[PDB]
Design a protein around this ligand. Structure first.
Ligand SMILES: Cc1cc2nc3c(=O)[nH]c(=O)nc-3n(C[C@H](O)[C@H](O)[C@H](O)COP(=O)(O)OP(=O)(O)OC[C@H]3O[C@@H](n4cnc5c(N)ncnc54)[C@H](O)[C@@H]3O)c2cc1C
Ligand SMILES: CCCCCCCCO[C@@H]1O[C@H](CO)[C@@H](O)[C@@H](O)[C@@H]1O
Ligand SMILES: CCCCCCCCO[C@@H]1O[C@H](CO)[C@@H](O)[C@@H](O)[C@H]1O
Ligand SMILES: CCCCCCCCO[C@@H]1O[C@H](CO)[C@@H](O)[C@H](O)[C@H]1O
Ligand SMILES: O=S(=O)(O)CCCNC(CO)(CO)CO
Length: 495
């Protein structure tokens, strides 16, 4: 019975969420990721769990309402990596009238069930604010921040938690129907080891590659086109000490975020640039930098230059091509397509789908796949808690409680584990009783005990996986220290 019930191609947020949900419904599931979990679009987001305020002008009510309500659901599912955040919108009357803004905020507050997130409010900016003097009025509202790459990992762990299988660095090369079953072929991108599996169902959740897999992997016609819209972000030492984020209205009608990041930086993003080519080669261009710095510099007193940038990242949104002439106007809602052959071997493909709406998307996916499976269990993820989320507060409790239980833990390290691993911290600490038991110090309190844990429980294979996806330690480790991390991984993944 080597036949899996469902095979999921794609290890980003959408593929992980679908696989986890499926496994939790009793299906024998296998998820395939060509490189590393969240190595593409899912680790290149603005990292916000938002309802999509700007989509209201386009009347995308279905998406905005679903997104808004999911915020609190995700907040309870992964309290260790997600949390409430307040956003400040500077008023720019020549762009949008005050009455217009208020209507939007009203919908944003009632368009979706809001049990804990505070309501919107008006703001007054004085001569001592961070914004320029001419800007005197604004508004503030709620939304959430989430460690995108880690939300993906949490779901991958869930898959395994429920008897599922997850393979990384394994690229699916082909898939075709045969005798009522799917024959999926894949190969280890490193060793060349080939695999061949049989499945009763197949999900194409390869994001930017969705159509590409239809053409080269299955030789089947894709039900939808895909618009690749690149978006980049720049990182700089925090521009101010305030805990809230700002949402700026640019002259082209787009909005740009300035978000507090890891207490030391500010993330500024994003952009909408039509893109063509390999989604893996995407990178920020000069005009993007000029565009993000300008909108920031026109709003804040403290001026930023190109020289203040400490890091940048970019990714491409795989938006379902609605033929919109304007990249910023293209819809952000997702579309799912399911098709079978003679009532068997269904194929569910995913087009679009924000990180914010992934759980709902995954639920709707299993809904379409239900008719094809035995006594498949019903929905369940809404009342679940992702691995690492079984805490009691986050900072409120966990970080404090961790140092209390593991006194040798400095306040910074305790904060890191709490905000990264959550309830999985005790598994990482194992029998450690002192700092020395944590092993080699690679820098910035990133110990061997953490890296060993990442390889054993978080599929880490390369340094980048560990320093830029499972964590953001890459922001502090110098070139030699990162080289050492890679060297350790070789020696550990060797024998
Ligand atoms: C600029 C930007 C900002 C964003 N901001 C936000 C925001 O703050 N909030 C929010 O909710 N959303 C945001 N998003 C949207 C969100 O990031 C994406 O919608 C989501 O990550 C898409 O996930 P995915 O799983 O569909 O695709 P991906 O994350 O791209 O995953 C697809 C995966 O498939 C794998 N794959 C491809 N081919 C194969 C193959 N043949 N075999 C095996 N594996 C394969 C890839 O390696 C990859 O990991 C943003 C997106 C962009 C880029
Ligand atoms: C302008 C002096 C009275 C104080 C009100 C705060 C100023 C911002 O008020 C704004 O002014 C705009 C025009 O500039 C209007 O179009 C409005 O949308 C708005 O209410
Ligand atoms: C039902 C929810 C809608 C609430 C009504 C929104 C009206 C906002 O109205 C605005 O207020 C600004 C400041 O007073 C103004 O300066 C005004 O000129 C006006 O444009
Ligand atoms: C009768 C006309 C009513 C139209 C109300 C549309 C709601 C406005 O939505 C607006 O979207 C903007 C970006 O798109 C955001 O910057 C604003 O915060 C938001 O109020
Ligand atoms: O911690 S979990 O059980 O959720 C996932 C453990 C995954 N372990 C691997 C070891 O190579 C990846 O780290 C895969 O078996």
């Amino acid at each position: 019975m080597e036949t899996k019930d469902l095979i999921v191609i794609g290890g980003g947020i959408n593929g992980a969420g679908i696989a986890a949900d499926a496994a939790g419904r009793g299906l024998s599931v296998l998820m395939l990721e060509a490189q590393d979990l969240a190595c593409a679009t899912s680790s290149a987001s603005s990292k916000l769990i938002h309802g999509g305020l700007r989509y209201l002008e386009h009347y995308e009510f279905r998406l905005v309402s679903e997104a808004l309500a999911e915020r609190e659901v995700l907040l309870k599912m992964a309290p260790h990596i997600a949390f409430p955040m307040r956003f400040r919108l500077p008023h720019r009357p020549h762009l949008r009238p005050a009455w217009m803004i208020r209507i939007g905020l009203f919908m944003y507050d009632h368009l979706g069930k809001r049990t804990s997130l505070p309501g919107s409010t008006g703001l007054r900016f004085g001569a001592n604010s961070v914004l320029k003097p001419e800007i005197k009025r604004g508004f503030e509202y709620s939304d959430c921040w989430v460690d995108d790459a880690r939300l993906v990992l949490a779901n991958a762990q869930m898959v395994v938690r429920k008897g599922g299988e997850v393979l990384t660095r394994t690229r699916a090369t082909s898939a075709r129907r045969e005798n009522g079953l799917w024959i999926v072929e894949a190969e280890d991108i490193d060793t060349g080891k080939k695999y061949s599996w049989q499945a009763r169902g197949l999900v194409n959740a390869t994001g930017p590659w969705v159509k590409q897999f239809f053409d080269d992997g299955m030789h089947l016609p894709s039900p939808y086109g895909i618009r690749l819209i690149k978006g980049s972000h720049i990182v700089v030492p925090r521009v101010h000490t305030q805990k809230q984020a700002y949402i700026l209205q640019n002259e082209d009608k787009r909005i740009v975020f300035v978000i507090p990041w890891m207490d030391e930086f500010s993330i500024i993003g994003t952009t909408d640039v039509e893109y063509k080519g390999d989604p893996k080669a995407v990178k920020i261009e000069e005009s993007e930098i000029n565009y993000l710095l300008n909108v920031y510099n026109t709003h804040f007193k403290k001026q930023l230059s190109r020289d203040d940038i400490v890091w940048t990242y970019s990714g491409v949104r795989p938006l379902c091509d609605d033929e919109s002439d304007s990249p910023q106007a293209i819809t952000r809602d997702y579309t799912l397509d399911i098709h079978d052959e003679n009532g068997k071997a269904p194929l569910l493909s995913v087009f679009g789908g924000k990180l914010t709406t992934y759980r709902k998307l995954a639920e709707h996916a299993l809904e379409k796949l239900t008719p094809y499976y035995q006594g498949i269990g019903p929905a369940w993820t809404k009342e679940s808690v992702l691995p690492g989320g079984a805490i009691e507060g986050d900072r409120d409790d966990y970080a404090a409680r961790l140092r209390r239980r593991y006194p040798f833990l400095t306040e910074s390290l305790a904060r890191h584990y709490a905000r990264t691993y959550g309830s999985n911290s005790e598994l990482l600490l194992g029998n450690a009783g002192t700092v020395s038991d944590l092993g080699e110090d690679f820098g910035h309190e990133f110990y061997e005990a953490e890296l060993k844990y990442l390889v054993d429980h978080e599929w880490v294979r390369r340094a980048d996986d560990a320093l830029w996806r499972r964590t953001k330690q890459g922001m502090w480790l110098n070139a030699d220290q990162q080289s050492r991390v890679s060297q350790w991984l070789v020696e550990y993944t060797q024998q």
